[PDB]
Amino acid sequence: AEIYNKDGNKLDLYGKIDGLHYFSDDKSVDGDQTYMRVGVKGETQINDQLTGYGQWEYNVQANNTESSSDQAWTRLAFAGLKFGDAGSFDYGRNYGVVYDVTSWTDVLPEFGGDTYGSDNFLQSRANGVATYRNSDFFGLVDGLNFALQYQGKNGSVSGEGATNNGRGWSKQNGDGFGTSLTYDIWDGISAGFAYSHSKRTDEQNSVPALGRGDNAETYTGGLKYDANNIYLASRYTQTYNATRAGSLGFANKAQNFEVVAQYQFDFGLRPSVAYLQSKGKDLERGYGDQDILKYVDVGATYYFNKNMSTYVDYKINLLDDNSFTRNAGISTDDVVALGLVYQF
Amino acid sequence: AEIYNKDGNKLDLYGKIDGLHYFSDDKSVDGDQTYMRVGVKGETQINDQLTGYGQWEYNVQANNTESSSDQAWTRLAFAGLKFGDAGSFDYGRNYGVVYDVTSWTDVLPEFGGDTYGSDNFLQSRANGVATYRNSDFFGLVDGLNFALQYQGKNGSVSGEGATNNGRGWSKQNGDGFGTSLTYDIWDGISAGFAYSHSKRTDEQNSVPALGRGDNAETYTGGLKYDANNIYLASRYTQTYNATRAGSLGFANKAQNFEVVAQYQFDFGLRPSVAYLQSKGKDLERGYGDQDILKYVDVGATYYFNKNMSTYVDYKINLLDDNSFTRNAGISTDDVVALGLVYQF
Amino acid sequence: AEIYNKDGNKLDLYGKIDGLHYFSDDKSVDGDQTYMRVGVKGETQINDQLTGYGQWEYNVQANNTESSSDQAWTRLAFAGLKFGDAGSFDYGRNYGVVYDVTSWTDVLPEFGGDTYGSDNFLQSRANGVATYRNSDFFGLVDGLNFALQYQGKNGSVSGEGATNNGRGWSKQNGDGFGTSLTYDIWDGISAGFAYSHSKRTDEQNSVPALGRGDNAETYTGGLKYDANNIYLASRYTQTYNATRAGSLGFANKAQNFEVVAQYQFDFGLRPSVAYLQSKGKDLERGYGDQDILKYVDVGATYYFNKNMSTYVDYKINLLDDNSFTRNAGISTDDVVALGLVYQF
Amino acid sequence: RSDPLEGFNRTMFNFNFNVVDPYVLRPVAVAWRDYVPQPARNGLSNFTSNLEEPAVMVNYFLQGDPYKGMVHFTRFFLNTILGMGGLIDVAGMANPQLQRVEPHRFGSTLGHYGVGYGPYVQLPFYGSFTLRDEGGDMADGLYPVLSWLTWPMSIGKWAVEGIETRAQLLDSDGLLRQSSDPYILMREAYFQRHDFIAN
Amino acid sequence: RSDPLEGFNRTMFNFNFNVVDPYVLRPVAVAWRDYVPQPARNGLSNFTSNLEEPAVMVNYFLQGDPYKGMVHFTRFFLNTILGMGGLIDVAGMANPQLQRVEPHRFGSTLGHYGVGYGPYVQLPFYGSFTLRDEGGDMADGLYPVLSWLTWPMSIGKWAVEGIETRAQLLDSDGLLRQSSDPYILMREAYFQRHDFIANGGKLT
Amino acid sequence: RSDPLEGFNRTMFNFNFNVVDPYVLRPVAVAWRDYVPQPARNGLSNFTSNLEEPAVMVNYFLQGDPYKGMVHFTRFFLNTILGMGGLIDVAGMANPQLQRVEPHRFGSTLGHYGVGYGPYVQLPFYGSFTLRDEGGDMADGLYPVLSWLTWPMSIGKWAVEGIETRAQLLDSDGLLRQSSDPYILMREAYFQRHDFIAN
Ligand SMILES: CCCCCCCCCCCCO[C@@H]1O[C@H](CO)[C@@H](O[C@H]2O[C@H](CO)[C@@H](O)[C@H](O)[C@H]2O)[C@H](O)[C@H]1O
Ligand SMILES: CCCCCCCCOCCOCCOCCOCCO
């Protein structure tokens, strides 16, 4: 909500409270999952040419004890400048540009968007990303937007590959970069492409047992239709040494694919059908070709107004129970979710 | 404080900063206890019939170092709808309904409300509760208020009884339900009753030393007088397998009792006298009948206005120092507390 | 930003988001260091004479994963009343008064103020500080400001030296007090003195290897010039058993000194030159007189407006690579820092 | 018109009209109208209605109109999950095209695809049974919500719905009693109500 | 008015009036008014006054009136915890009904139940002493916080308060010295001020 | 006006004016103006200019003016670190007094201390060349920013800058050509710009 706007300064306090419950045979997923998001968005106009901005957004889980630990974490935090027709530049913890197209399939009522993780080579939110963005291609090609982005090493907690903000192999990275291009064709149809390229840490290539390679790249194409209360969207990605094979490491090759279809009823209900799929190739302990993710997803959300909505979402999980699911820790079971959402 | 009200949506950013110090011979209680609370309460008007809401409130302990751990936690977070006066419904982390009468004695300047805990079946704030509430009983009896509530299992971190939001017993629970009824009788006088009933987890009935039983029940009645700057209140609850015996487990049976008297002076001081007491019966290992809580409490708070207040509160603690207090981790020592409070 | 001011109550939601990256040969410092601050400052006018107030401020690290721990902490939280001609009084977690003169040298774009730590007696922010302050010496001597302050024990996590808010030797303290005096001599010129005295805990005198003494005192004098867009400031302090010898304990004796020079340009750039230095004397275990800190600092920051700023900062680190620098974990490498900062 | 079993029916109807209705059921409905309060009447009516709304959906799909199919999906969902298992009509409060309406079930889809009714039976204690609607509707007890009812529960639902229906009709009793032939009118109302829901 | 020791009393008063007051004390009170800054005067006056507010409550309870009983509780609590051990009159600026007022102590309650003064001793260097009020008020040195003072501390408080009271009277001393029978006024002013305190209460 | 090599110069200038300019260079600048979009020209122009701002800075310090020295510090600092390695002129948008100005560098520094030009050569493909400015300017390729270039990069940079300025003069082409004696105009213009930067 715009809570400040005096003399070219604007402040936006936003968030959502989502009372949410999971039913599942998997005792890791089943139960209460109530959580909360809070954030601030800030704008300051410096000149007519130049305007500066920042955003922070916090996720805090309301589904445990008051004596419980690590229930909060920072999802976004960045500042930047916006130069009008020369673009914008930002730095902080922010979304990868890969997500400039793959976001088009991240529209499900509560699941989806899990062919990738957070802190995973710029497929979604990441530490240490500088991002140049430009809309309408330098004011030339109306409706064509491109983005360029670089990210420095986030290494081990200690050792020769260490940095200040070290972590484990699953979310480490060397220096890397990515870029994205998206075009709005004939009002409602949209095409996009995204590329990413990052070095991998010595621990990446020594500790997890699965995944070997000096670099980690992703190729993505996606289309989407958004008109006449119809929403269709699809996205295809190839990744090398980038998609995680659960706890066992990374897939040397993986092809990820998503399809979504939605209708928006005048009375306020929006149903959703989707199919999602991640298949890993050349894994290193005999796993060979293995599936990492695969499910149909059916669900719906009822919108009371722009501020309150409720939803149900049903993940029909098509993974069989391999020695590879049961060693990577990949959930094999279906899941149903109900949520009621206040947002401000 | 109301910081937004545009287009029938209201947002309230509220909290308090409490500079607070404990004096006690008990080194777990003695010292600085400064903390702060911040939260949001939100409303959106949907129709003439229907109106939606949510609220979150956070507890941040400001009394340790900046290198310290687990100083913050969510006490409330829930969303809901309110149906004019077919009632209201909400889900999230919210107060148990037992607290709809038990709250009447939780009014001391700084102590009290500790015959029970948080995350203690439906007695205080809890994970995963759906709560229906109804005022003036369906337009049948002006001033009689009713409530019903359910909570799903919140189990162990691992094993057959596990859920996503695992914890240890004393804050686990099986599926359960509770109900509350309160009546505004003549003028200031009010009667209330509450019943709660939850399955108990296998871990509760296996790992601690005290308390065995398939269920955990609570029966509570209380009265209160609130008129002519007098506040008198008393509450009696009987418990089966539900009130914690400190660190040792649960008391198979326990009767808890609280009585408080307060006057509010025109010039701004509110003194308070109270007595509180929890006695646990048929405990195991030879303890038999032992006292869990027992103290007189004297204190007072000065209100400068709606926004600043001060208090002293003296817990005159009558617990003996048993073989049982020292093994359950029960504080035997007195404590005095001084606090200065800004609220917004 | 002032987001509420109705009924004699003012509410200020303020903070900063700082996208920030460190280049250094030292992998404890090198990498992303993006973070954010959020806080509340509230004022309530009680009478014509009386005004109550509170402030809380939070530090949130945005530079690690969402799986990471202890990324947020409270730096400030206190409430108080301000009497005007009789001064002000408050309690909470707040700055030690030694910092009322030492603050004059804490103005670099990113470094400085690290001859000491936080939770380091009363030299920076500490738990449990009551501080009386008086401006213009009880309305008698115009421009002379003084402060008096006391702090209760913040002891062990357990043992005879324990308190509720336990911690480790490096951030413990006994009962202590401090005092500050500052005088505005001419106009732009200012002199200051501060005195501190604290009991040190039994653990401080037993578990760390360096530093023994019943008490922990500090003497400080400082000067400053601030006019015509020039800022010159300097500070010299000696410590007994108060300055930390990195991880190895405390320096029995230590002399700290800081010098900074800044000009504020017509066009918005403020360059900064500084030198800082901390020397430990009579250290034990053969460490004679050792240097704790030693570096020149060159830097500059550009202000776009009251809300946006950017900076570079170059710490030219002159520490030799001793046996003492390394065993305390004292970084010997230089550091370069770039930051882009949105504030609200 | 129809009524091959007109003779059989008229005897079951006169048994229903002048033996079970004056001596039971309607007395049971006068106790209902004087002793169970209006909120409990609205809550039971919605709670039972709600168990049929998933089948109304599955059948609006089969009759070609998936829009009203999701009107009754939305009705079931808001009302099951937020209106206390169907007790509160939240959907009705949320929006006019989610108001509660009379069920369109498997008899309707059968009638909408042109299948004819049975003869016309009139049953003792029951009332009126066509092979296509009553009983054809039983096909909706093969898929969930109504396949979850044990046979005891189905009659409980049957009963409370009936006593309420009787309870509402208590104030227009008459003109079935002040009418030359109340079998032909009661039957005419039958087919007009049932042809309208098969549309 | 009784006065069995009137002969004794006028002898001590003339000692107090024309030797102790001109030769000492009034020099001590002008040095006070000329050398101690007004804030340190307000801080000392507030600080000593505060040591008596627990006793003022304990006796307002004993007199049937618990409302002003906690008025002086509120004064003690706000001023000790927020006014720096009593130095700052926090309660006083916080609300008009908590302003400082002159104490009602055990002499007051003895008098409010009608006990009776006794004679009227006049002491050299002390001034006016009744066995009921002075001395009866001494019972409030049996319970805290006034029982916490060493006897040195009790002398300091009387001294600092005495010099301050004289320092404030410095501007009306000159108008008692000429007025017929200055013993009678001081004796009446005593019994006028002291009878007002038994039910009734105003001050500064 | 000085010019000891006027004879040599006028013949090299006619080589530059009527064979090097019409047959190459100006065709390359007409191609530049019609085939490279304006944003890439703005970025190339900004990028190379940016490498000269550390030297302008060090030379304003040498000329006694430490204020404008740091005007060019911040221009380099905002534009390298926020304007994408020099592509975008952030400092220029941030404040009128950090807008681009023509480089000063070491020739400027000599002229500000009263040194005075060489003669005045005109070179066969280069153009106007003085020993103090075009020659002294080489002193700033001794310390970083400009010491980091291959000698290929310094040749690249000269080329891109020359083609851009050539492209801009394209619409004022026709008015040095409608003039008697164009060597004198080209020479006075040289000495007016170059004495202006030295002051
Ligand atoms: C709202 C109005 C205010 C109410 C005023 C206060 C009510 C007063 C309640 C007094 C009750 C105390 O009653 C008495 O408590 C003591 C102290 O625990 C118990 O005594 C117990 O503890 C003591 C010491 O702690 C042990 O040495 C002893 O062996 C054990 O029995 C007595 O068995 C009980 O009879
Ligand atoms: C790294 C050291 C930097 C220290 C430089 C201090 C320079 C002080 O100079 C003050 C200059 O003020 C001049 C007035 O502002 C000029 C406005 O008009 C500019 C005309 O071009």
Domain chopping of chain F, boundaries: 1-199
Read off the amino acid at residue A33: Q
The answer to whether the beta carbons of residues C61 and B1 sit under 8 Å apart is: no
| Ligand nearest to the Cα of F73, by number | 2
Residues with beta carbon inside 6 Å of ligand 2?
Answer: C 263, 266, 271; F 66-67, 70
Ligand 2 mean position, distance from CA F100 (Å):
17
E94 in contact with chain C, both atoms CB, cutoff 8 A: yes
Mark yes or no for CB contact C44/B342 under 8 Å: yes
3-state SS assignment for residue E138: helix
Distance CA B38, CA F35 (A): 59
Minimum distance, in Å, between the CA of residue B154 and any CA atom of chain C: 22
E95 vs B268, B310, B312: nearest CB: B268
Check if B275 has its Cβ closer than 6 Å to any atom of ligand 1.
yes
Q: Residues of C with CB below 8 A from A44's CB?
A: 304-305, 307-308, 342
Resolution (A): 2.9
Q: What distance in angstroms lies between residue B334's CA and the mean position of ligand 1's atoms?
A: 14
Query: Cα separation of D128 and C18, whole Å?
Result: 76
How far does residue C308's CA lie from ligand 2's centre (Å)? 22
**Which positions in chain B touch C70 (Cβ < 8 Å)?**
67-69
Cβ contacts below 8 Å, chain A against chain D, sum to 32
CB spacing of C77 vs B341 below 8 angstroms: no
Closest ligand 2 atom, residue F68 Cα? 21
Q: What is the dihedral of CA E68, E74, E79, E80, to 10 degrees?
A: 110
Find the ligand nearest to C300 CA: 2
Alpha-carbon distance F183 to F176, whole Å?
10
How many angstroms separate the CA of residue E143 from the nearest CA in chain B? 19
> Chains D, B in contact: 3+ Cβ pairs under 8 A?
yes
For CA atoms D96, D99, D103, D106, the dihedral sign is: positive
- From ligand 1's centre to the CA of B321, what distance in Å? 13
Q: Which residues of C touch B31 (CB under 8 A)?
A: 128, 152-155, 163-165
Burial D43-66 (b: 16+ CB within 10 A, else e): bbbbbbbbbbbbbbbbbbbbbeee
Q: Inform me whether the C-beta atom of residue D62 falls under 8 Å from chain A C-beta atoms.
A: no
The residues, ordered by sequence, that sit 6+ positions from F113 with a Cβ below 8 Å of its Cβ are F63
Q: How many CB atoms lie within 10 A of CB A84?
A: 14
User: How far does the CA of residue B40 sit from the closest CA of chain C (Å)?
Assistant: 13
Taking the domains of chain C in order of start, what are their residue ranges?
1-344
Centre of ligand 2 to C-alpha F59, Å, is: 15
SS (H, E, C) F160-186: HHHHHHHHHHHHCHHHCCCCCCHHHHH
Query: What's the token pair of residue B47?
Result: 């129709």
Which residues of C contribute to the annotated binding site for Mg(2+)? 212, 241, 252
CB B70, CB A69: distance < 8 Å: yes
C315/C24 Cα distance (integer angstroms)? 10
E strands, chain C, in order: 2-6, 9-23, 31-32, 35-45, 51-61, 72-84, 87-94, 126-134, 144-151, 176-183, 189-199, 215-227, 230-240, 253-263, 269-281, 290-305, 308-317, 335-343
Using the Cα atoms of residue A342, residue B1, residue B4 and residue B9 in order, give the sign of their dihedral. positive
* Chains in contact with chain C (at least 3 beta-carbon pairs closer than 8 A): A, B, E, F
Q: Which residues pair with A232 in a beta bridge?
A: A225, A261
d(CA B317, CA E182): 59
Alpha carbon of B49: minimum distance to chain D alpha carbons (Å)? 6
- Does A265 contact D67 at a Cβ distance shorter than 8 Å? yes
Q: Cα–Cα distance between A212 and A129 in angstroms, integer?
A: 24
In DSSP terms, B100 is beta-bridged to none
CA distance D117 to E119: 120
Q: Which amino acid is at A138?
A: F
Q: Which residues are registered as beta bridge partners of C223?
A: C191, C234
If one residue of B320, B332, B333 were mutated to test the ligand 1 pocket, choosing by the most ligand atoms within 8 A of its CB, it would be: B320
List binding-site positions of C. 212, 241, 252
Q: Where does residue C20 fall: left (phi above 0), alpha (psi -120 to 50 degrees), or beta otherwise?
A: beta
Tokens in use for A250? 């990374």
Closest CA relative to residue A196, chosen from A181, A173, A218? A218
Contacts of C35 in chain B (CB under 8 A): none
Atom 12, ligand 2: which residue's CA is nearest? F67
Angle in degrees, CA B61, B63, B65, rounded to 5? 105
Contact C344 A81 (CB under 8 A): no
Binding positions of B are 212, 241, 252
Among B305, B310, B314, B336, the residue to mutate for chain E (most E Cβ within 10 A) = B310
Instruction: Show me where chain C is broken: residue before each gap, C-N > 2.5 A.
Output: none
CB contact F90 to A (< 8 Å): yes
Residue A212 labeled ligand binder? yes
Indicate if the alpha-carbon torsion angle D144, D145, D151, D154 is positive or negative: negative
Q: Name which of B111, B117, B62, B116 is nearest B334 in CA terms.
A: B111
F36: distance to nearest CA of chain A, Å?
12
Which letter does DSSP use for residue C156 in this model? Answer: B
Å from A16 to nearest chain B CA?
A: 9
| Chain B residues closer than 8 Å to A305 by CB | 44, 46, 52
Helix (H, G, I), strand (E, B) or coil at C212: coil
- Tokens of residue C178, six digits: 């401090």
> Maximum CA pair distance of chain A?
65
Which ligand has its closest atom nearest to the C-alpha of C230?
A: 2
On whether any CB of chain A is under 8 Å from the CB of F153, the answer is: no
CATH class held by domain B1-344: mainly beta
Q: Indicate which atom in ligand 2 lies nearest the CA of residue C271.
A: 1
Q: Is B274 in the pocket of ligand 1 (CB under 6 A)?
A: yes
Separation between Cα atoms, residue F48 and residue F58, nearest integer Å: 17
Q: For residue A28, what is the nearest residue in chain B, using CA coordinates? A: B164
Q: Which residues lie below 8 Å from residue E113, measured CB to CB, with a gap of 6+?
A: none
Of the candidates D92, D60, D59, D96, the one whose C-alpha atom is nearest the C-alpha of residue D76 is D92
**Chain A residues in contact with C60 (beta carbon < 8 A):** 56, 58, 74, 77
Inter-chain contact A267–D77, Cβ cutoff 8 Å?
Answer: no
Please choose, from the candidates B246, B88, B103, the residue with its C-alpha nearest in 3D space to the C-alpha of residue B169: B246
A94 annotated as belonging to a binding site for a ligand: no
Count A/C contacts: CB-CB distance under 8 Å. 156
Do the chains contact at C300 and F78, CB–CB below 8 Å? no
Q: Report how far residue A74's alpha carbon sits from residue C61's, in angstroms, rounded to the nearest whole number.
A: 8
Contact D102, D59 (CB under 8 A): no
Which token pair is E91?
Answer: 């309660």
The experimental method behind these coordinates is X-ray
Of the candidates A167, A149, A171, A145, the residue with the CA atom closest to the CA atom of residue A158? A167
Contact of E84 with chain B, judged by CB distance below 8 Å, is answered with no
- Beta partners for residue A272, in sequence order: A262, A299
Q: Does any ligand 1 atom lie closer than 6 A to the CB of residue B296?
A: yes
Under 8 Å between Cβ of B292 and B279: yes
DSSP secondary-structure letter at E18? I
- Rounded-to-integer distance, Cα C30 and Cα F155, Å: 37
